[PDB]
C-alpha cells in the first residue's frame, strides 16, 4: 500500500492511492474539512503511512496524510474552500481521487494580478499618474469593497506591495519594502541567524544643517550602483526621504542605514560647532 | 612542412592555449614538442590543418591515408585534456 | 534493488533503476512536482533506499529519492520546470526514466552568457563604453523587461556581477564585489569559522588632509602586486574610491581595509595638529 | 568481494574489483558524474564496502566508493572532466575498469609549468627582465586570455606564486608569500594549534627617524643566515620593504616580524626625544 | 593467517605473509600507491588483521596494513617512489613480497652526507674557510640546482643544520640551533608538557653600557663547562652575538637566556644612573 | 602455551617459549627490527599472550611480546643493533631463541668506564691535573672523534657527568649536577609530585658588600655536615661559586639555595644602608 499526489486538468488535486489486496471499494466520506477513506482488510504498515507535502501547489488539496488503522487503512486528504471529490478505478486495486489622500470610492478586486497592473488601473481610474520602478515586486491578490482608491492603495502597499512617493503630478512607487527584500535575503542566507535580520526605517534629526545639503553626499553613497543622478537608488531598495521639518528618514538594510547615519551625523557635527 | 613531420598524432594533444585580444588560438604538443595552431594552421602527424578554435576545444582537419590506402583529409574537434 | 542517475542526450536526467524479481511494469505517475513508481511484490530493504545528490547538474531532475514501501517499492524523482517522462525497458528487470544614470529603455534577456559579453552588448546599445578588467567574474543569467539599460546594469551588478566606476567616456567595471571574492575564499578556507568572513566596505572621513594627497600611498599599499600605476589594484579586488566631499570609501577584505584605514587615519592625525 | 585501485598507461585510473561467485556481467552505467556497477546475487557485506582515498593522484577517477546493495553490489566511482570507461574481464570473477604596471595584452596559458619558467617566458615577452631567487616555489597551472602580462603576473602571484620587487631594470621575485611558507610549516608542526599560524604583513610607521638608517640593523637581524649583504634575506622568506612615505612594511613570520618591530620602534623612540 | 615484515638484500622491504589453508595463488595488484593481495576462501579474522609500524626503516615500503575482507583476505602495502614487486612461494601456504653573502653559482647535491663534509666541500669550492665545532649535528640530504653556495648554505642551515658565524677569514659554524638541541631534549623529557619547550632567540638592547664590556661576564656564565676562553660556549648550544648597533642577541635555552638577560639588564641599570 | 626470557653465555638474550601441542617447527623470520614466529594449529589464548619487561637488561633483546594469531601463535621479539638468532629444540614442544679551555685534539672513546677513570686518562693526556671528589657519580659511555680534550670534557660533563672547577694547577670536579642528585632524589620520594622537583642554579647579585666576606658564613651553612674547612661542601652537592664581577652563583637543591639566598641578601642589606 502507498499514497501519491499529482496535478492535472485545471488546478486539480489528484490523489493516486495504491491498494494491493483489495477487491470491492472503500468508504468515501467527503467532509467540509478533509476526506476519509477506509479499506477493510487493507491494514497498511506504519512504514507506508507517509504523508505528502503539496503545500502552496495552487490546488484544492491542502495536503495528503496517510494513517494506518486498526485493521483497515484510513486516509486524510485535507482540503480548502469549495471543491468536489471524484473517485476513479482504473483497475481492481488502484484507487484515485480527483479533487477539483482623498479619492473617489472604488471597490478593488484584483485576482492574481501584477501590482504594476493594479498600479496602472488605479491611475486609469483618474487616480493620479502612478509610475513604478521597473522590478518592484510581483503579483498580488486583494479584494476590497467600498474603499477609496487612495485608501485601498495604502492597504495594497501593506499587503506585500510597495511604498509610494509622489512627485506631485506623477507618483513613483518602489519596492522599498521591509518584508520582501529582506525576506528573500533571509532565505538566501545560509546561516539560521541570518534568517533573522531586517531592513529597518529610522529617522535622523538634523539640528545644525539643512537637510538638502546632505542630498548630494547621500545620493552618492546610496548609489552603490551606477547612476548619474537618482533620488531613489539601488543597493536593493535603499531610500532617503526628506521631511519638511528638516529630518531625514531612511528606509533600507541595516548596513546601508548605518552608513547613512554615520555620514549625516558626521556632517551635522561640524555644522554644530557654531 | 616542419619538424612536426617527425612526430605522430597519438602524441599530439591539447596542452595549452594562446590568444591575443579575441583571435583565440590553440596550443598543442607532440612528444614534448610544443607547437601552436590558429584559424587555418598546420598540425597532426601526416597533413594536419586546423580551421577554428573554441573554449576547451579546437576544430581541426588533417590528412591521413585511409578509406583507400592513400592520403585523405579528416576533420575533427579535440576536447581540452587538462 | 537499487537506483541510479545519469545524464545523456542534451541535458537530460536519466534514472536507471535496478528491478530484480519483477515481471510486469510498475505504476508510472508523472506529477507536476515529482514522479512516482510503485512495484508490487518488489518491496526493497531500507539498506537500498539510498537517495541521489545530483544537485546543480543542469538537468530537469532536481534529485532522485528512493523509499521502501509496505510491500512495494516507491520512487520519488523530484523535478523542476516543464519536462517530459520517458520509460524504457531494455530487459525484464531493468527500468529507466529519461527525464527531458539615465538611459533608453531596453529589455535585457541574457541566457547563460558571460557578464563581459553583456557588458559589451550594453555598450553597443550606445550605453557608454564599458570596459571590464580582465577576469571579473563569470557568466550570469538575467531576464528583464521594460528597464533602462542603466537600471538593468545596476540590477545586473547586484546579481553576482561587478560594481562599476566611470572615467567619464569609458567605464571600468571590476570584480570588486563582496560576495564572489569572499565566497570563494570562504570555501577555500579549511576552518569552518573562516567560512564566515567578509569583504566589507567602509567610509573613512578625512577631516584634516585632502583625499588626493593620500592617493600615492594608498595606491602603493593597495598594490600588493606588481603594478606601475593603477587606480584599481590587485590583492584580489581591493578598491579605494574618492568621494567629492573628501571622504574615502574602501571596499575589500577586512585585512586590507584595516591596513588602509590605519594609514589614512595616521596621515590625517598629523594634518590634525594645526 | 572487494575493490581496488591502481594507475597504469598514461595517467589512467584503473579500478580492479574482486567478484567471487559471479558468472555473467554486471550493469555498467557510465554517468557524467560517477559510475554505477550492479551485481545481481552478489550482495557484499558491509565489512567489504570500504572506499578508496586516491585523492590528488592525477587521475580522472576522483575516488572509488563501495556500497552494499539490497541483494546486489553497487559501485560508485566518482570522476572528473571528460573521460572514458573501459571494462576488462581477465577471468570469470575478476572485473576491471580502466578510467582514462602596464603592458601588452597577452593570453597566458601555462600547463603544469614551473613558475620560474613562466617568469622567464614573460621576460622574453619583453616584459621586463625578471629574475627570481633560487628556490621560490614550484610549478603552477594557469590559463588566462586577453590579459596584459603585467596584470596576469599579479594574478599569477596570488595563485600560489611569489610577490615581486623591482630594481627597475631587473626585477627580483621571491617566495615571500604568506601561504606557501607557512602552510608547509603548519603541516610540519605536530601540534594542531600550530597548524593554525601565520606569516603576516604589517606596516611600521617611522615618525622620528629616516627609514634608510634602519636598513643596516634590519638587514643584519633579518639575516639569520650567512649573507654578506642582501636586501632580501633568509630566515625562510622574511622581507622588509621601504615605502616612499617613510614607512616600513615587513612580510614574514610573526616571530620575525615581532623582532623587527621591536627594533624599529626602539630606534624610533630615541629619535623621538627631540 | 598473519602478516610480517623484514629487510634484506640492499634496503629492500620484504613482506612475509602466512597463508594457512590456501592452494593456488592470490591476486597481486601492483599500484603506484600501494599493493593489493586478495585470497579467495582465505577470509582472515579481525584478530589477525594487525598492521605493521616499519616507519623510517629506510625502505620502499611505507607500512604494511592487513584488513579482513568479506570472504577473502585483502592486503595493503603502502609504498613510496619508484619500486618493484617480487612474489616468492617457498611453499604451498607461505607467501612473500620483496619490495625493492655573494658567491659563484653551484648546484648542491648531497645525498645522505654529513653536514661537516658538506661544510668542507663548500670551503674547497673556494667558498670561504668553514670550520665547524666538533659535534655540530649529523648528516643531511639536500639537492639544489642553480644556487650560489652562499645561498645554498643558508638553505642548508635551515634544513636542520647549523647557524654560521664568520671570523672573517675562517668561519665557525655551530649547532646553535633551535630545533635539534631542543627537539632531542623534548623527547628526553618524560613530561608531555616538557615535550613542548623551546630554545629561543632574543635581542637585548643595551642603552647605557657598551656591549663589549659585558663580554667577560657573559662568557663566564655561558661557560657552564670548563673552558679557559671561548666566545662560543657549552651548556649545549648557548650563544651570544654582538651586533654593531650595540645590542646583544642571545640564542639558547630559555633558562640560559633568562640568566643572561638578568645579568645584562642588571649591569645596564647601574650604567643607567648617570 | 607461554613465553619466557632469560640471560646466559655472555650478555645473550634467550627466549624460552612453551609450545604444548606442536610437532614440526614454526616459521622463524629474523628481521632487522624484531623477530617473527608462527605456529600453525598453535593458536594461543589472549590470557597467555603476556609480554616481557626485560628493559635495560644489557641484552640484544629489547623486549619480548606475545600475541595470539587467528589460528596460529605469532611472536614478536624486538631487538637492537647487530645480533644473531639461534633456535634450539631440546624436545618436541619446547622452543628456544638465543639472541646473541684550549687543548690538543683527541678522540675520546670510553666504553662503559668510570668517569673517574676518564678523568684520570685525560689528565694523563697532559690535560691538566684533574682530581675528583670521592663519589662523584658512576660510569659512562661516550665516543667522540676529532675533539679537543677540553671540549670533550665539557661534552662529557653534560652527558651525566660532573661540573668542573679549577684551582689552576689542579682541577676539582664534583657531582654538583642537576640531574643525578635530584633524579635519584625524585625516585626516592614517594610522592608523585616530589618526582618533579629540582636542584637549580641561581645567580645572586651583591651590590653593597664584597663577595668574599660572605664566604665564611656561606661555607658554614653549606656544611650541613662535618667539615673543618671546605669550599665545596656536603649536603649532597651544594656549591657556591664566586664570579669576578662580585656575584655569587649557587648550584644546589632549592631548599639549600633558598637558605643561601636569604643570608646573602640579608647581609647585603645592611651593607646597603650607607
Author numbering:
A (entry chain D), C (entry chain C), D (entry chain B), E (entry chain A), F (entry chain L): 226 to 325, 343 to 516
B (entry chain N): 84 to 165
What does the paper say about this structure?
The secretins are a large and diverse family of integral outer membrane (OM) proteins which comprise key components of the type II and type III secretion systems, as well as the biogenesis systems for type IV pili and filamentous bacteriophage. Our previous work on PilQ from Neisseria meningitidis showed a dodecameric structure, with a chamber sealed at both ends. Other proteins seem to play a more direct structural role: PilP is a lipoprotein which binds to PilQ and is essential for type IV pilus (TFP) formation. PilP thus forms a link between the OM, through its interaction with PilQ, and the inner membrane components of the type pilus biogenesis system.
